[PDB]
């Protein structure tokens, strides 16, 4: 048991074990199953047998996806209670009454995913650069912030001494390989637009060895700056 | 219908995505990752455990472990790409880029799922028009009637003033239909006493259905949708 537990086919014995396992440890259940769906809320509907993906989150979020759109086909908010008996039901009797049932026909697989909660400025660095472009370079003119480009968005964009377009990518932590690749994409996009004379300067307090490497390798520059 | 790799390398993921594109399956990745978005504005989410769903029509969804809505999503018709990150770009006239930079892929699942291809209201119409198809002196009163623990197709009152629950199915009535009706009947029995009848209205029913009905004190009535 690490972060993913799978049963490449479960029986009813298994599912109940796995749901409880998930409730116990606060994991996410994802079932792939041929099934049908029955809903009772404001009105009463069903969907016939078909292949669906069903996601049950620790806080009671319940989602039913079939294989086509962005939206789930049916869903239920945090705070809905989960129950099993050959069907998974999520009922919110939280003052409307609502019942969403997945009658499992054929459970292809169930996956428990013991996922950690996700716990939640560069605008101020930009302020510094506009205030005193000299932190970047002598005679650098910053022009745009969050500038839409053909293939992306550039933190600060300006023009240097020689009239070359200068792209700035601002990070506030150690700049990684990803940062450099991100900036590269912006530079290349603009190179396809204004010619070979576009500079990419990565502005951060420091950077990885890999970052420094790919920069040199790529003809791009670094500039040291602390979020004040 | 399900292919799993309980840990994939980059070699694997590319095989699996292509496998999925080829056969038109759904990819579901469980991964520690981070997310970078560029659309109207530019955002990121730090490292965390997320579920990523990639549908054959380009639907792209990123869920973390807490709300109903995905944390980031992309509509049908967005194009998918892999290089240590999965990207979905819609340059479909706004430009939008959603990137999952995979830190640690816990598992990837391909699910080769069939398209889903899509009345009892008319049966109800028949019943209100001529209650006699149910019974002599049956009065149908409500349609899609909200009840304490559910919704009743048709609800009425019989000759003797008993509450009558109708469950209408248009196909062979199964065990599930009977159980469904039972729930409604029981709910109402806890409300109005023991004198509530449950009549399953369908063109026919399983042996199991006929059984559980008899076993349960519930009735059947034969009726064909138009």
């Amino acid at each position: 048991m690490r972060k993913v537990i799978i049963k490449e086919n479960p029986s009813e014995e298994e599912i109940k074990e796995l749901l409880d396992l998930a409730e116990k440890h606060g994991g996410v259940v994802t079932i792939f199953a041929r099934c049908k769906v029955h809903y009772e809320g404001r009105a009463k509907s069903e969907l016939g047998e078909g292949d669906r993906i069903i996601i049950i989150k620790p806080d009671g979020s319940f989602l039913i996806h079939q294989n086509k759109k962005r939206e789930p086909v049916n869903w239920q908010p945090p705070g809905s209670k989960v129950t099993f008996k050959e069907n998974s039901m999520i009922s919110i009797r939280r003052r409307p009454y609502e019942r969403l049932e997945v009658e499992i026909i054929e459970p292809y697989s169930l996956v428990v995913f013991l996922a950690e909660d996700y716990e939640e400025s560069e605008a101020e660095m930009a302020n510094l650069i506009f205030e005193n472009p000299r932190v970047i370079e002598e005679g650098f003119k910053p022009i745009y912030r969050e500038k839409p480009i053909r293939h992306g968005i550039v933190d600060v964009m300006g023009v240097d001494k020689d009239g070359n377009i200068v792209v700035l990518e601002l990070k506030r932590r150690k700049a990684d390989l990803h940062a450099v690749s991100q900036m590269k994409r912006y530079v290349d996009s603009l190179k396809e637009e204004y010619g070979e004379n576009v500079r990419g300067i990565l502005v951060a307090p420091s950077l990885t060895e890999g970052a420094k490497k790919l920069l040199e390798k790529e003809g791009l520059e670094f500039r040291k700056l602390e979020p004040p």
Side-chain angles (χ1 to χ4, degrees), chain A residues 36-150:
Chain A
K36 34 209 266 186
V37 182
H38 310 270
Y39 176 79
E40 291 166 25
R42 182 171 190 91
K44 193 166 156 186
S45 75
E46 55 185 316
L47 308 180
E49 68 164 348
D51 308 310
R52 295 180 183 94
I53 306 179
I54 294 101
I55 296 171
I56 308 167
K57 302 196 179 170
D59 68 352
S61 296
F62 192 98
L63 316 169
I64 297 173
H65 268 95
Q66 31 203 221
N67 80 336
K68 262 179 146 72
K69 300 153 93 173
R70 165 223 149 182
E71 315 85 342
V73 109
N74 275 292
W75 78 88
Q76 204 108 83
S80 313
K81 170 69 191 176
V82 194
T83 269
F84 180 59
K85 206 215 179 192
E86 157 59 0
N87 84 339
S88 298
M89 298 115 92
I90 189 133
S91 310
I92 190 149
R93 26 196 140 219
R94 288 216 182 164
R95 258 323 188 202
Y97 167 81
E98 289 185 71
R99 210 182 97 110
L100 188 58
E101 159 180 21
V102 172
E103 97 172 279
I104 306 193
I105 282 173
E106 163 83 9
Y108 302 116
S109 167
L110 185 162
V111 175
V112 183
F113 178 29
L114 305 139
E116 264 174 43
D117 293 9
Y118 171 76
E119 320 280 8
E120 311 296 311
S121 83
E122 303 163 7
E124 242 101 44
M125 290 170 77
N127 290 344
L128 227 297
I129 294 153
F130 277 87
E131 199 138 0
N132 186 226
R134 209 181 271 256
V135 302
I136 305 305
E137 242 187 45
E138 160 65 31
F140 163 67
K141 300 274 163 278
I143 307 179
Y144 307 102
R145 286 187 202 237
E146 299 193 62
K147 180 67 174 174
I149 249 60
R150 279 182 188 186

Side-chain angles (χ1 to χ4, degrees), chain A residues 165 167 180 183-184 187-188 191 196-202 211-222:
Chain A
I165 282 166
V167 166
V180 177
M183 184 173 71
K184 180 176 164 53
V187 171
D188 288 344
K191 275 178 182 167
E196 203 75 4
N197 290 337
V198 166
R199 298 207 280 127
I201 303 166
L202 209 208
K212 190 169 76 66
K213 229 92 189 81
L214 185 55
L215 282 178
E216 282 167 32
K217 190 199 286 165
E218 208 65 60
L220 314 165
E221 306 159 58
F222 174 77

Side-chain angles (χ1 to χ4, degrees), chain A residues 1-10 14-15 17-23 26-33 52-58 104 107-115:
Chain A
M1 173 196 53
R2 225 188 100 143
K3 285 200 172 173
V4 145
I5 303 129
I6 293 164
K7 228 76 149 72
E8 204 177 59
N9 196 291
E14 267 110 278
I15 295 157
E17 273 187 41
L18 292 167
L19 300 186
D20 294 12
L21 213 181
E23 175 168 30
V28 177
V29 192
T30 305
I31 297 150
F32 314 73
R52 295 180 183 94
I53 306 179
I54 294 101
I55 296 171
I56 308 167
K57 302 196 179 170
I104 306 193
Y108 302 116
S109 167
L110 185 162
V111 175
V112 183
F113 178 29
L114 305 139

